[PDB]
């Protein structure tokens with residue numbers, strides 16, 4: 001379509017694909033302890049990120065998963081989190097939908 005690739009909204013960095021969305025919903029609405037609301041889309045796969053630090057289970061929105069902050073590898077924009085250490089699946093990405101731009105391949 002014109003809606004197959006997700007890029008960083010701020011710089012255009014290639015991040016993910018609609019094909020790589022992971023449900024039983026791809027969309028999750030969550031709050032951090034600073035009360036910031038995020039509309040998170042779960043992806044099986046993403047690229048062009050920089051994962052910062054080591055995983056933490058603190059305040060994890062997803063039972064059994066530890067998170068690392070995922071920046072845009074290009075521009076440093078906070079795009080979401082990489083989740084690991086869980087089961088079925090072991091890992092995935094939670095990306096902030098409004099920080100991405102959807103478009104053609």
Ligand SMILES: O=C1CC[C@]2(CC(c3ccccc3Cl)=NO2)C(=O)N1
Nearest residue numbers: 031032033034058059060061067081
């Ligand atoms: O799964 C998640 C990932 C991101 C996180 C954890 C978090 C945080 C962690 C330690 C100290 C202060 C904060 Cl503000 N903020 O957003 C969250 O709430 N849940």
Ligand code: NA
Nearest residue numbers: 013014047048
């Ligand atoms: Na690249």
Ligand SMILES: [Zn+2]
Nearest residue numbers: 008011072075
């Ligand atoms: Zn960017």
